[PDB]
Design a protein around this ligand. Structure first.
Ligand SMILES: [Mg+2]
Lengths: 97, 96
């Protein structure tokens, strides 16, 4: 049976974007702020669309390897070694309108 | 009808966690790194569970208000005024 939930929210406050991580008890509906960090970059890039959770199989792992390979051309964090992609992996599909 | 895709990935590299935002064009299949940011905290808390996208209706807006009200007790960023929660909003279900 459900023990509770964790939520990850992108919340604007004072015109700035933050990531908030919240825990919630199923039985009491009592809530806890786990983390509040930012400002964070907005999700996505261009175009409207709907977000979905996808699995983290080989295709998603190779997207992570792509991202690290590209970042290593930039070098902002030094030379990085890809380890793995973790859940959740989110995908937005953008339809031409 | 499909223009392309965007991905938001949590990727460990050199044992540090980063958020990577990637675009993919449907017609060319080309991929672009939009943003790479971190180190970031891992999503969720301890314990496993399954993630889903939820809507940003009143329940979700009130979670955002909860968060801003709580953060305003500490004040690491000063005093904040809640504006809104945007998409995507993610929910992880934890089972007993
Ligand atoms: Mg959907």
């Amino acid at each position: 049976e459900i023990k509770g939930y964790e939520y990850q929210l992108y919340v604007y406050a004072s015109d700035k974007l933050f990531r908030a991580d919240i825990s919630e008890d199923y039985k009491t509906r009592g809530r806890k702020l786990l983390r509040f960090n930012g400002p964070v970059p907005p999700p996505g890039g261009s175009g409207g669309g709907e977000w979905e959770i996808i699995d983290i199989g080989p295709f998603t792992q190779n997207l992570g390897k792509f991202a690290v390979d590209e970042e290593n051309k930039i070098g902002q964090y030094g030379r990085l070694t890809f380890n793995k992609v973790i859940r959740p992996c989110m995908k937005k599909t953008i339809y031409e309108n």
